[PDB]
């Protein structure tokens, strides 16, 4: 019921600023702290600061003082973290969280990956991986989507708008020589019902505002 919904991943050029948002619902916005954190892989979790929207009081980690600015808009129950003078090292997943006074930070948002780079965004091409006689095993069939040539990360993939989760594997992206990324997502389903069921991979690449819904079906030879 408590929900914190963050804005989408973005690429930003060095020297630029970025303002991440955190839309709060399911509780009284002015009565809880919003905490901000970031995480880079291998390098763990860092506290940026917290803000109490009922008054707008802020505490900052000294390492982020002067570069990070937290604000909160109590008319829309949205908190914001602006990070300025962006450098490559600021590439990270930024999280917001909710903390009742006296308690720990809970209900973390889903994270926002900010990538600092001079390279322009590029949306993915999405291709089907059709089920076939070469993807069957004992009455099941594998099928998928190949999501090629995008930048920066991340791409998310769901199947059938989130109603198909069992047997799904969405793989970590790989770095191509070009500096673009690719990934694949597959799912195993019953072979018996390939004729009656419809499998759609829903691909979202927020940095380029690209959404693709690709139907994946057995193909006539």
């Amino acid at each position: 019921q408590v929900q914190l919904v963050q804005s989408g991943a973005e690429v930003k050029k060095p020297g630029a600023s970025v303002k991440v948002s955190c839309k709060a619902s399911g509780y009284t916005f002015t009565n809880s702290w919003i905490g901000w954190f970031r995480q880079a892989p291998g390098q763990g979790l860092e506290w940026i600061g917290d803000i109490y929207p009922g008054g707008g009081y802020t505490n900052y980690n000294e390492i982020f003082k002067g570069k990070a600015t937290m604000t909160a808009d109590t008319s829309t129950n949205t908190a914001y973290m602006e990070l300025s003078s962006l450098r490559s090292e600021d590439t990270a997943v930024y999280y917001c969280s909710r903390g009742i006074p006296g308690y720990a930070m809970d209900y973390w948002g889903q994270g926002t990956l900010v990538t600092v780079s001079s390279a322009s965004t590029k949306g993915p091409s999405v291709f089907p991986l059709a089920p076939s006689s070469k993807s069957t095993s004992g009455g099941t069939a594998a099928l998928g989507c190949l999501v090629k040539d995008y930048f920066p990360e991340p791409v998310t993939v769901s199947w059938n708008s989130g109603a198909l989760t069992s047997g799904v594997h969405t793989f970590p992206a790989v770095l191509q020589s070009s500096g673009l990324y690719s990934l694949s997502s597959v799912v195993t389903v019953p072979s018996s019902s390939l004729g009656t069921q419809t499998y759609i991979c829903n691909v979202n690449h927020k940095p380029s505002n690209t959404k693709v819904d690709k139907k994946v079906e057995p193909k006539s030879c």
């Binding site: 979790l45 720990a104 973390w108 993807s135 069957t136 793989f171």
Partner: protein
């Protein structure tokens, strides 16, 4: 600031095992006013945000499994899983909640060891849609195997390929503790059309000899 140190950096255990891990702070997290130790434990799985498990060192967050518990005081703390379940694979972080700035340990990654399981191997030719674009990706899928070390080789007309493929492996599965792997062989449409047999050959600890999945272009 307060430095948090966790040990071990990672561990592997079997389902059902009792698992413990350590978190040490450079300064005491014991609050003299209310006698609480302000240490928090989070669980984080790949691609997900941290999930609150324990606060005030030993108070379980509502809904957290009984098998999880925090203990300790002052500068020395422990997190224990009494009976490790498949869904408990994750990195566990401790956090100083005592004084600003809040600081975190670098985590303990909990992994599961289970019985060997050979991969199920599938292959996908390029889509005609991709071919129109001038490129051809052939994908080899290795599903639900253990341990993670599977080796894939691509052969085109029985010739071993080098330099034209990429692969990645999943995180460990939270239900069956297996891994999966996807490898993509990418060629120009022109090169793809010059050869007939496309094969991915897999070796794995659960296979006595290699397993190959292949197709003939245009068959």
């Amino acid at each position: 600031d307060i430095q948090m140190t966790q040990r071990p950096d990672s561990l592997s255990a079997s389902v059902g095992d009792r698992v413990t891990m350590s978190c040490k702070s450079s300064q005491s997290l014991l609050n003299s006013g209310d006698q609480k130790n302000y240490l928090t434990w989070y669980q984080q799985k790949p691609g997900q945000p941290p999930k609150l498990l324990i606060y005030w060192a030993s108070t379980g967050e509502s809904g957290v499994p009984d098998r999880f518990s925090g203990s300790g005081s002052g500068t020395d703390f422990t997190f224990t899983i009494s009976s490790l379940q498949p869904e408990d694979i994750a990195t566990y972080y401790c956090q100083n909640d005592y004084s600003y700035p809040w600081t975190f340990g670098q985590g303990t990654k909990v992994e599961i060891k289970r019985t060997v399981a050979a991969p199920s191997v599938f292959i996908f030719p390029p889509s005609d849609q991709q071919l129109k674009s001038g490129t051809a990706s052939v994908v080899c899928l290795n599903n639900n195997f253990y341990p993670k070390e599977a080796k894939v080789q691509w052969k085109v007309d029985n010739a071993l390929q080098s330099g034209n493929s990429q692969e990645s492996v999943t995180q460990q599965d939270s239900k069956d503790s297996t891994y999966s792997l996807s490898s993509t062989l990418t060629l120009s449409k022109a090169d793809y059309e010059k050869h007939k047999v496309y094969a991915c050959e897999v070796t794995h600890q659960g296979l006595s000899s290699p397993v190959t999945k292949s197709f003939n272009r245009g068959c």
